[PDB]
Design a protein around this ligand. Structure first.
Ligand SMILES: [K+]
Ligand SMILES: [K+]
Ligand SMILES: [K+]
Ligand SMILES: [K+]
Ligand SMILES: [K+]
Ligand SMILES: [K+]
Ligand SMILES: [Mg+2]
Ligand SMILES: [Mg+2]
Ligand SMILES: [Mg+2]
Ligand SMILES: [Mg+2]
Ligand SMILES: [Mg+2]
Ligand SMILES: [Mg+2]
Ligand SMILES: [Mg+2]
Ligand SMILES: [Mg+2]
Ligand SMILES: [Mg+2]
Ligand SMILES: [Mg+2]
Ligand SMILES: [Mg+2]
Ligand SMILES: [Mg+2]
Ligand SMILES: [Mg+2]
Ligand SMILES: [Mg+2]
Ligand SMILES: [Mg+2]
Ligand SMILES: [Mg+2]
Ligand SMILES: [Mg+2]
Lengths: 117, 151, 42
RNA sequence: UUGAGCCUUGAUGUGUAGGAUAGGUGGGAGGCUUUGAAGUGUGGACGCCAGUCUGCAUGGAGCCGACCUUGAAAUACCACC
RNA sequence: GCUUGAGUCUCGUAGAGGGGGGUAGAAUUCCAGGUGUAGCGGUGAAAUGCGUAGAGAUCUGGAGGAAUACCGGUGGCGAAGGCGGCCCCCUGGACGAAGACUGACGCUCAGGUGCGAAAGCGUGGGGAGCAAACAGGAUUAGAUACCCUGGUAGUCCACGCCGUAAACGAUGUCGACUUGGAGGUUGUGCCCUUGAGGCGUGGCUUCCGGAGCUAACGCGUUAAGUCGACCGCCUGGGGAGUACGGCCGCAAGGUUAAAACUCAAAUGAAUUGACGGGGGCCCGCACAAGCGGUGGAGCAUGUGGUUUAAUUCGAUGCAACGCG
RNA sequence: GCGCCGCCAG
RNA sequence: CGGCGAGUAGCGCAGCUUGGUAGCGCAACUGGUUUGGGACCAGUGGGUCGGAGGUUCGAAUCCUCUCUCGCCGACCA
RNA sequence: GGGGCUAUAGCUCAGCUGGGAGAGCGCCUGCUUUGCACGCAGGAGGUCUGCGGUUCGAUCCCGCAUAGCUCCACCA
């Protein structure tokens, strides 16, 4: 198919879920997987394992593109910031960079109100 | 227990074969302290298992155990007011304890004539799979695989 | 795969995400900033 | 750019037996045949990786047929799809 | 008259002090495209919601509002309320240094006047995010809540009004005096400044603690100590900071402020316990790991009840019920 | 995640 | 006066159209859980379908009359 | 009317495939928990009605039978 031998894995690690989107360097998505879509729901969905499994399922579904080197970009606090990067390496990619791109406002917009649980 | 965390003791070897493993198996099978009754049932059932499948007496027994011994099982942890069914590696002693308990439990459910037949069939079943004890093992593994997230 | 990204600890990245999750009323930060440094004592 | 039709020329078909990823039949006994073959290098092609389909090279005239195993038997060529 | 209180001038210093204008970067949301495909989001778990009409994710471009990460500090400034990116303009105060100047010009302050968080109100703008009200989803016996998904006033700006807050140090202002210790911050003087030294002297400020004080807790040179000047305020709990009247306000309400009636208390601090869905550490067949029962059947036995002439009396959560 | 209540005098 | 509708378990309601067998929630009952109440859990039970007559082998169900209770109409003068 | 379409677990819905009945929620056990939910793992549960076609057609040619579905409707 396309000549993509070096892309970027975008890891969106929320508290509730992990989305892994592999893309070319220009930012066009090639494939993706989520902890939510990998047969993990509710409490199991928000685990480092479900994120691992998602990263496995995302490594598959960019086999056709023929990627070898990927930079990793990790958003979010959630479980599976790190279990996702391990899984990408274990799936036989050459991890090149690991940036963190969690957006911090320099003050900015008022967050929602504190939960009273 | 809280303080002194000691248990178990010396056992005699099986009279016939000289196997502590097999002596435990008799104890699982025994009821109401009728050990003579139990070891008669085991020997009858092993005799049949030996002539049926070939092999030695204990060699046939161990093969049945190999196919029912669980590797992992779910526990319960309570982290922050929330019960997770965490899978934990079952120790070697408990490994064959559950194996032996599930075989006996299965054998007592079967609707054959003698316990010795019931048991012999269940040992044969276990050695080839398809039995109720191997279903227990399989079920225990599926439970543990489902909760691999909580490790 | 040495994964020593302790630079995230250095930038207190996870720290800053946790504090920004919900609004802290000015009164509440003041109280915890005062309680933080009263506790910082021999 | 992008479909839709049509023409022409190519490629394509995974019961279980299994030369073995078999659409129906004949003018039906061979032809594509030194606008070169046995065997091997490479690439394209799909995949239920078993395998087949071949271009470009090289080697440089031989691969091949119908038998015996199957519901279905030549795809030995060709012709109607 | 005098210069010690108070003030003026000179030279500097630090500062989120105030008003006005400008601008920067991050982030959220929305909009338009590209890539891409079945989930996203959310929770304790869900669902509502969003998504094949292509969401979420990712990249590009644009719009717009609000707030200024790090610095950042029991740091600073301000009468208090308060004030935090950077730049400029206008402007207030504080402190230090020596020296000159005026000559008690001071302190306090009823009434009065001004300033005064947030919410709220008026008119006109603005509106990203957040979010009373509201709606739906949950939870629950119910759930007009807490949790979730949305979401309007409002939050933002201009001008005006309101005049209140646990507007707190629950501590009025001014002045004097009275053992110490460790810091922070900001000046300034002297000394081999001989390297993020040493010895002084000011201002502001944090913590500890001595005498003293205090019901105690604590306060302790920034006093709640020892005194002086002036002001404000209190007089049992409730009724009530309410009613009536006045004044103020567009309104909401504010402010001033009773009485009848009712009770023998209400209250502060500290003490011993007990308790906690507070914390820490421990134990017991408490749980877990197991094995065998009870609850179903028939019968024995005790009890409740009912019945009876009488069904003698007692035992009644655990710790009465095969018990006296 | 859910956990409401405890008549009068003594 | 005329018209429509309703009458089913203690209460609130399905079922009737289209004949065979009456449901549902709450309440009530017994047991369990609690020191005890509530809640919760597990077991039960309780109606001949307002009254009468008719058709039918058989009527809550279809037809007729009646009682009770609602609702609507009662206009032009 | 004449056509073209779907009509499968009790509910739900895919099954381009001529080599076959699958998921989630109910219901039944087991683990689970102070119980209760919550969650997790097993387990049952049958493909309008007939022919044709055969190498097998929940799956296709053909004809009927169903509710759904739109078009003609001066259907006189
Ligand atoms: K200034
Ligand atoms: K909101
Ligand atoms: K709004
Ligand atoms: K004391
Ligand atoms: K009084
Ligand atoms: K008229
Ligand atoms: Mg005054
Ligand atoms: Mg305001
Ligand atoms: Mg306004
Ligand atoms: Mg306005
Ligand atoms: Mg909300
Ligand atoms: Mg006041
Ligand atoms: Mg204040
Ligand atoms: Mg006061
Ligand atoms: Mg004054
Ligand atoms: Mg002190
Ligand atoms: Mg008043
Ligand atoms: Mg008044
Ligand atoms: Mg136990
Ligand atoms: Mg009994
Ligand atoms: Mg008695
Ligand atoms: Mg007594
Ligand atoms: Mg007792």
């Amino acid at each position: 198919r396309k000549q993509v031998s070096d892309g970027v894995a975008h890891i969106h690690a929320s508290f509730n879920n992990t989305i892994v989107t592999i893309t070319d360097r220009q930012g066009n998505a090639l494939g993706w997987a989520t902890a939510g879509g990998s047969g993990f729901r509710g409490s199991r969905k928000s685990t480092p394992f479900a994120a691992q499994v998602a990263a496995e399922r995302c490594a598959d579904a960019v086999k056709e593109y023929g990627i070898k080197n990927l930079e990793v970009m990790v958003k979010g606090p959630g479980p599976g910031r790190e279990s996702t990067i391990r899984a990408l390496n274990a799936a036989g990619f050459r991890i090149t960079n690991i940036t963190d791109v969690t957006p911090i406002p320099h003050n900015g917009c008022r967050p929602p109100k504190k939960r009273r649980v | 227990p809280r303080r002194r965390v000691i248990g178990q003791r010396k056992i005699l070897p099986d009279p016939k074969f000289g196997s502590e493993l097999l002596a435990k198996f008799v104890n699982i099978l025994m009821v109401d302290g009728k050990k003579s009754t139990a070891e008669s049932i085991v020997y009858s059932a092993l005799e049949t298992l030996a002539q049926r499948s070939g092999k030695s007496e204990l060699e046939a027994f161990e093969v049945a155990l190999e196919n029912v011994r669980p590797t992992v099982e779910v526990k319960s942890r309570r982290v922050g007011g929330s019960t997770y069914q965490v899978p934990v590696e079952v120790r070697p002693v408990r490994r064959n304890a559950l194996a032996m308990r599930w075989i006996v439990e299965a054998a007592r459910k079967r609707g054959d004539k003698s316990m010795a037949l019931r048991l012999a069939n269940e040992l044969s079943d276990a050695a080839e799979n398809k039995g109720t004890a191997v279903k227990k093992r399989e079920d225990v593994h599926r439970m543990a695989e489902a909760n691999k997230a909580f490790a | 795969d040495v994964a020593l990204r302790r630079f995230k600890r250095s930038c207190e990245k996870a720290g800053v995400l946790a504090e920004v999750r919900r609004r802290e009323f000015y009164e509440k930060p003041t109280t915890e900033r005062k309680r933080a440094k009263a506790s910082a004592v021999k």
